Design a binder for this molecule. Structure first.
Ligand SMILES: NC(=O)C1=CN([C@@H]2O[C@H](COP(=O)(O)OP(=O)(O)OC[C@H]3O[C@@H](n4cnc5c(N)ncnc54)[C@H](OP(=O)(O)O)[C@@H]3O)[C@@H](O)[C@H]2O)C=CC1
Ligand SMILES: NC(=O)C1=CN([C@@H]2O[C@H](COP(=O)(O)OP(=O)(O)OC[C@H]3O[C@@H](n4cnc5c(N)ncnc54)[C@H](OP(=O)(O)O)[C@@H]3O)[C@@H](O)[C@H]2O)C=CC1
Lengths: 222, 223
């Protein structure tokens, strides 16, 4: 029935999302890892559960992104639900203390990567039924939330991706796409499995485009 | 006396702000161009108003930015009013149709450029009296306005820099800095460069509180 694509599936929320989706009948899961050979838990899941297909992706690497569509296509003729989950969070604290390379790495990995990944997998998503597009954002990316914390290149990258996500939702509303930015929670802290359970109910239930959502389905201000 | 710094002063609003500042007594202007020797208007401006100093800045070029503090330090001990004006606006419309290079170029020129520029000229701004920091933003950069247009890399770059401008306002409030993101208007409702400059100069002088996102007319925009 349905194909999910989850970037960054070897650990954290991505692994827990793939584990949760692997439990549902009639769900095929394209799961990505930078280094699949070292994705122990994900490889063992895929060994027990043939519905889970493991593909290499480095979203920091144009040469990897240029291959994701042809490689995914070996395993599926369509994607129902796209989840750009793979990301970095390596730069917090004041602007004056954040060197050039942190800004660059968060832009390439957290902004350009997800945009190029979507661009490449759009034809596969257009061919699917559900046409859902989820960007795993952060409440730190809001322009209208104050946490009393600096988020530096990490927060900027989530705001940047948020801006483009909102635009994308407008652009693909006439093609009946559902596009969302989703804050997965602080992983008060929640566990990745709890986040994944809530994220997967959201992925299945969300029926409107253009939303910025917390994992529980409540709205966040852009 | 006060020292103003303006990136991208060879044409557009940049030129019009420098021209207006040059008219105000006791103002010295550090004015930037990528190619100061081709900046015929600004060079003539500076010839007639030598309080205007023309320095080389390409905000897309880290090697250029690594030299700005030294180039500016030639002419001043301090900056009272910093203005990141220099920027590009090359990519609009759909994401699927926005190639890699357009995303990269707006990030490097419109986001990284200004943060690097501010990091480099912060010691000079710190020594100054007014501690005013202005990023020429766009209303298109708002996460909370709908123009019935898509702004692609351009709009993303203005929203990215807005996020950091807000953080920078918070971060520098202790040091009594005034940090603002300012939409200068859609200059040639379009308004003239000279109209846009007059509004901005008034804003640059009047603004007394940090963390604001302002249109040229002094009303606030939602982040
Ligand atoms: N959990 C939280 O508290 C919050 C997290 N988020 C969002 O949650 C999402 C998931 O976070 P979480 O699982 O905790 O993060 P982790 O850092 O634990 O995991 C990140 C995942 O992304 C992968 N990844 C990183 N860089 C790349 C790359 N260049 N190419 C491909 N894959 C890559 C990692 O693979 P590898 O093992 O190779 O490094 C890993 O699978 C992120 O997208 C983030 O934006 C937002 C804010 C709050
Ligand atoms: N354009 C607009 O009216 C709108 C955009 N804005 C802001 O307006 C401001 C610019 O106004 P204005 O000058 O009239 O518009 P322009 O269309 O003239 O903007 C280009 C300016 O930036 C300079 N510049 C461009 N690229 C670089 C670079 N890599 N390094 C250094 N300088 C560079 C140009 O110099 P060069 O001649 O060498 O190319 C020129 O001074 C920017 O802050 C922009 O973000 C805000 C709202 C609407």
């Amino acid at each position: 029935e349905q194909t999910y694509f989850i970037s960054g599936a070897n650990r954290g929320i991505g692994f827990s999302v793939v584990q949760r989706l692997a439990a549902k009948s009639g769900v095929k899961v394209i799961a990505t890892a930078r280094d699949p050979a070292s994705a122990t838990a994900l490889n063992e899941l895929a060994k027990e559960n043939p519905q889970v297909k493991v593909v290499q992706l480095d979203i920091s690497d144009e040469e990897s992104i240029k291959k994701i569509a042809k490689n995914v296509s070996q395993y599926t003729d369509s994607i129902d639900v796209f989840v750009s989950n793979a990301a970095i969070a390596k730069s917090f604290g004041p602007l004056l203390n954040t060197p050039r390379e942190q800004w660059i790495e968060h832009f390439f990995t957290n902004v350009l990567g997800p945009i190029r990944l979507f661009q490449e997998l759009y034809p596969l998503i257009k061919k699917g039924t559900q046409k859902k597009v989820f960007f795993i954002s952060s409440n730190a990316g809001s322009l209208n939330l104050d946490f009393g914390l600096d988020f530096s290149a990490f927060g900027q990258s989530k705001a940047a991706l948020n801006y483009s996500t909102k635009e994308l939702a407008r652009q693909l509303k006439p093609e009946n796409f559902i596009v969302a930015a989703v804050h997965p929670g602080k992983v008060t802290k929640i566990t990745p499995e709890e986040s994944a359970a809530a994220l997967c109910k959201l992925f299945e239930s969300l029926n409107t485009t253009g939303k910025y959502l917390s994992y529980d389905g409540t709205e966040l201000p852009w």
